[PDB]
Amino acid sequence: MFKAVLFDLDGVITDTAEYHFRAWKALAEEIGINGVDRQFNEQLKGVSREDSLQKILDLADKKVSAEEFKELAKRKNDNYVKMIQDVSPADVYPGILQLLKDLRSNKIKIALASASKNGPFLLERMNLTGYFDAIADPAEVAASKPAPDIFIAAAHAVGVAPSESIGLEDSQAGIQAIKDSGALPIGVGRPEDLGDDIVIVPDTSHYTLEFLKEVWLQK
Ligand code: ALF
Numbered sequence: 316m317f318k319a320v321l322f323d324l325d326g327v328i329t330d331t332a333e334y335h336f337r338a339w340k341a342l343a344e345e346i347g348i349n350g351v352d353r354q355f356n357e358q359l360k361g362v363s364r365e366d367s368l369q370k371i372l373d374l375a376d377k378k379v380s381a382e383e384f385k386e387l388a389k390r391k392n393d394n395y396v397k398m399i400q401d402v403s404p405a406d407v408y409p410g411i412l413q414l415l416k417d418l419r420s421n422k423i424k425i426a427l428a429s430a431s432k433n434g435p436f437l438l439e440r441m442n443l444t445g446y447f448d449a450i451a452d453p454a455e456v457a458a459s460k461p462a463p464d465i466f467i468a469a470a471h472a473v474g475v476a477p478s479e480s481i482g483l484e485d486s487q488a489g490i491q492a493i494k495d496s497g498a499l500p501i502g503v504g505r506p507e508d509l510g511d512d513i514v515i516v517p518d519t520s521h522y523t524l525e526f527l528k529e530v531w532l533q534k
């Protein structure tokens with residue numbers, strides 16, 4: 316049986332994406348750039364903060380110094396951090412708390428394998444800290460998803476090899492990272508985004524211990 320489950324955070328445990336969207340809206344409003352709506356936000360999907368900022372400046376063909384650029388990125392992050400103070404246990408996705416409990420009671424290791432710089436904070440706000448054996452620090456990995464570094468770090472932190480683990484992800488790039496770590500991926504979302512060579516569930520309520528066992532055995 317698998318010995319560990321390696322969890323991505325956004326789109327698996329909870330959604331941060333709305334707070335991000337709203338942080339950018341506020342920044343855009345503050346600096347007087349029209350066009351930062353939900354539709355435009357699609358183009359900020361898994362895009363870095365600096366690249367996202369660039370797309371926003373591009374809406375008004377605005378040019379800035381390196382220092383102004385840096386300051387604007389900082390302000391968006393300040394907004395974001397402010398907005399996430401109200402994350403609560405009610406923002407835990409469906410199925411996830413029960414999975415954590417079942418994994419822990421079956422002595423299966425639990426690790427966070429997220430690029431969120433606010434991982435420990437958000438887990439604490441959702442009252443989930445006690446279930447985690449480890450959080451792989453994204454500041455300490457050389458390369459982000461689709462590189463496997465973060466999943467490898469996560470597995471190692473709980474005393475296992477990636478090959479003894481399941482990885483849970485909502486992004487193609489994350490799925491690819493899990494593959495390359497040697498862990499077994501189970502995606503959540505649709506095959507359009509994720510690929511169709513891996514097991515995928517439609518939402519997180521399908522992530523149960525029973526289902527993960529099913530998948531592990533058939534592999
Ligand atoms: F929290 Al993620 F890819 F969604 F690191």
Ligand SMILES: [Mg+2]
Nearest residue numbers: 323325326485
């Ligand atoms: Mg994700």
